[PDB]
């Protein structure tokens, strides 16, 4: 049993990585649902209101749905759980890297530094690209030849859920990086 040589930071990171995998599985299940985006045209042809007749079939609506999923929605907004799953696989692979490997000190600080830089890169990229998960999307695909409308407004059904999942994911990686930075401080504070 290596639990004696497993301090609190390693066990905390293990449980956090399990949480990462659970979050990624939940996000993949969210992406499993067929109904992803819902698109309606713009400028479509007490006061009584009347519904606007878009003059569109079901399959035309589905076509605009997938087209605006293609060319208007952000790639991170479409594969955020995908990146989450890949990156937690990387986390559990390189979390036991020192265990699965002055050479002892060397590979231990190598593991800590690799974990720290992965954490920092994840923080930078997530903080940069998290704002792109929006509900109201403006889509300007050129399918006027088939539908008749050149501009569309769409809604991403689970965009709020992806933003909340990204907030929880960022909190988890934040605790991860705080405990790993404490590990690095303890390692490099003394010889």
């Amino acid at each position: 049993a290596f639990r004696v040589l497993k301090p609190w930071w390693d066990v905390f990171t293990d449980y956090l990585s399990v949480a990462m995998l659970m979050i990624g599985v939940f996000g993949c299940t969210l992406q499993v649902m067929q109904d992803k985006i819902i698109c309606l045209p713009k400028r479509v042809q007490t006061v009584e209101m009347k519904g606007l007749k878009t003059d569109l079939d079901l399959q035309q609506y589905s076509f605009i749905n997938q087209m605006c999923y293609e060319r208007a929605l952000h790639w991170y907004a479409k594969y955020f759980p995908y990146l989450v799953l890949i990156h937690t696989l990387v986390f559990m692979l390189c979390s036991n890297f020192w265990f699965k490997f002055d050479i002892l000190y060397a590979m231990y600080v190598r593991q800590t530094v690799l974990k720290v830089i992965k954490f920092l890169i994840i923080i930078a990229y997530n903080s940069a690209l998290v704002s792109k998960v929006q509900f109201t999307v403006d889509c300007n695909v050129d399918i006027q030849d088939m539908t008749g409308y050149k501009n569309f407004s769409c809604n991403h059904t689970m965009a709020h859920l992806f933003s909340k999942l990204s907030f929880c994911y960022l909190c988890f990686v934040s605790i991860y990086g705080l405990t790993c930075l404490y590990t690095l401080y303890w390692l490099f504070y003394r010889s």
Partner: protein, 197 residues
């Protein structure tokens, strides 16, 4: 293992309460991921952003397609449904997971007794925050939901009156959840006093 002598009846009771809270969270998340939606019909005759609510009977033609209806349902599901009514299963999942981490803290972490003392303070203060936030927001879930998203440029109407089908379920789930939390907290509260005396 042989830790049942180190696990007294309050730790086992809180563990079982946590298991029930976990499967409640799983049930809520499953319901929200599969069958959760809203069903919105526009208010045909409106009086200042308010539904006035007024030879045989014929169905009202809104002339909205099924897709426009889907758009209205999603848009009203975000901007007007109360956030607790949408994030209750994820909130209870997060609370259950943090309770599990707190209750199983010494099992993989007189310093042990002081650690349990700090653990009990943290767990009981989280119980206090949990019960306050849950009690204050249980009555903020309603079946019939008003909506004023101002999407007249896409469907032609402003105000909508939607139905949230599983909303009551969440309230009922939340209701049961309150009992569990209270039990958990009450049990934990005794432990604090049991170590205070």
């Amino acid at each position: 293992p042989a830790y049942r002598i180190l696990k007294p009846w309050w730790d086992v009771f809180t563990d079982y309460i946590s298991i029930v809270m976990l499967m409640i969270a799983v049930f809520g998340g499953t319901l929200q991921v599969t069958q959760d939606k809203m069903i919105c019909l526009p208010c045909k005759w409106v009086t200042k952003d308010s539904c006035n609510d007024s030879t045989g009977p014929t169905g009202i033609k809104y002339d909205l397609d099924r897709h426009q209806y889907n758009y209205v349902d999603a848009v009203c599901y975000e901007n007007r449904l109360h956030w607790f009514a949408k994030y209750f299963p994820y909130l209870v999942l997060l609370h259950t997971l943090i309770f599990l981490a707190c209750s199983n803290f010494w099992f993989k972490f007189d310093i042990v007794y002081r650690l349990y003392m700090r653990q009990t303070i943290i767990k009981v203060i989280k119980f206090a925050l949990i019960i306050c936030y849950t009690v204050y927001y249980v009555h903020n879930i309603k079946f019939d939901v008003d909506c004023t998203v101002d999407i007249e440029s896409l469907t032609g109407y402003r105000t909508y009156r939607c139905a949230h089908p599983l909303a009551t379920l969440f309230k009922i789930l939340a209701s049961f959840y309150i009992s569990l939390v209270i039990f958990y907290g009450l049990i934990c509260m005794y432990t604090l006093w049991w170590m205070l005396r």
